[PDB]
Design a protein around this ligand. Sequence first.
Ligand code: LAH
Length: 490
Amino acid sequence: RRALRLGVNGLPNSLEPVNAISNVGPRIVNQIFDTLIARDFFAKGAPGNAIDLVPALAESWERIDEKSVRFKLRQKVMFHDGVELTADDVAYTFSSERLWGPEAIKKIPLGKSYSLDFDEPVVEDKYTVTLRTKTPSYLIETFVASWMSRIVPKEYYKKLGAVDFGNKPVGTGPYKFVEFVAGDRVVLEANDAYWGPKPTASKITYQIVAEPATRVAGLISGEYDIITTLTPDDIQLINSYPDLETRGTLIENFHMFTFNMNQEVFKDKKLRRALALAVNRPIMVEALWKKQASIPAGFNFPNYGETFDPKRKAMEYNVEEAKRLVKESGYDGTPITYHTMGNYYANAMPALMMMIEMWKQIGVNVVMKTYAPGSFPPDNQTWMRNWSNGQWMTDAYATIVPEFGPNGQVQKRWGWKAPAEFNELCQKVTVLPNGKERFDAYNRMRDIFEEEAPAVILYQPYDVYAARKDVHWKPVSFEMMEFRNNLSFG
Ligand SMILES: CC(C)OP(=O)(O)O[C@@H]1[C@@H](O)[C@@H](O)CO[C@H]1O
C-alpha cells in the first residue's frame, strides 16, 4: 500500500473530536474515530451527496419515546490500543462529566452549547446503551450521526484528560494516530484491526500549506497525492495536466462574515444591516466562484429536510437603503478591521477585497487584518471577521440554535443582544416535533436573523480539491474527507 500525502489549508488545535469541529479537523478525526450511525454519501449511485444514514458502531437502534433512543452496539470492536468498545465508552462520550455538564466547559468549551438538552446515558448491558434528553428531542438520531458524536475510549481519555487526549488520540476508526506536530503535520497509519472496510493507505499525512499557490505547485511537482481548499480559478491549470484533475462539490456549509457585537460600533443592528445590504453576492459568485458556489435564501438549506423552506425569497441586496443606514448610524468614517486567517477559507481574501470596495461605495472604510494560525487576537482587538458554519443535522436546528441561540457563543461570547422573540422560538424549536408551528418558528427566526444581521451569510462554497488521477477518491457534500470504500491506487 502507498502512503497518502495531503496538502491541506490548515490543521485543528486538537484531535479531541468535538474540539476538532472546524473545516480542517473532521478530515482527520473521521479517520481516527467512528460514530454509532454513519452517513453513506455514495448510496444509490449518488455523487458523494446521499442523505442515507447507515449502521456503524451501533448495529441497530430504536427510539423508545420522545426523549430516548436505545442503541444495540457492534460486538468485539477494538480501539487502537486493543481495548474493546462497550456501552461504557458510549455513555462516557455523551456524559455530563465529559460533554454537556458544568465542569466539561474547561475540557470542551463548546460542548454544552453544541449539545442537546442531554440527560445522563443509560448503560443497559456491555453492548446496549440508551441516549436520552431531559426534555423532548426528536434530534437524537441526527445528533448521533454528526461530528459531535464520535466515540471516545472512557478509560484512556479519563487517564490522559481531554487536553492530552487531543494530542495522543485513540479511536476505533480506520486509521490510528502516529504524530501531531502543531502548525506542520498530522501523520496517521492503517488500522488493520478495523471492524469496517480495511484502510487502503499504509499512512496518511495532512501537511499544512497555508498558501494555495504553494499547495498547487506542490501537487504539480508532485509532493502530494491530494490538495484541498482551492478556488475555481485553479481549475483550468490543474486540469491541463493529463495525470492531474480537480474534484469539487458544493458542501453543507456556508461562508459568512460576522461581528464583535461587544464593540460600540456593532452593538446596534444599523451598521451591521447596512454592511449586509451592500453585499453583492451574485458578482462575487461570478468573479471568484465562476457560478460554482450557491446563494441560500437565508439561514435555510436543503439538508434541513422537513424544516427547509423552498418557497423562501433570496436575501435582500439594497445599496440605497445601506447608504441611508450608514448616514443614520453613529459611524464616522473610522476604519473598521476585518480579521482573516489568510486563505483558510477558499476565496476569503479575494471575497473581502470585493466587499471592501462595495462598502467604500456606501461610505464604510473596511481594512483587512491578517492573522497566523493559532494567533487569533483578543476578542476586543477584533471588529469584523470571517467564519463558516457546517450544517451538521438533517434539521434546521444546526446551526441557528447552537451558534446563534440563547446559550450559543454569538450571543454569549460575541455580544449579540438577540430579541426576546428569537430566543423564545429557539426554545420551542428544540422541543417541538416537526409540523406547522415548528416550520413557521424557524421562518420567523430566519426573518429576525436577516433584520438583526448578527452575521451575514455569503454563499455555500464549492469545495475544490485536486488530485493525482492514480489516487481514486471522491469528495463528499460535507467539510470532511471520506476514505471508507472511497480510496484506492491505480
Ligand atoms: C476556525 C474555525 C473554528 O471555524 P470553522 O469555520 O473552520 O469551523 C466551523 C465551526 O466553528 C462551527 O461553527 C461549525 O462549522 C464549522 O465549519
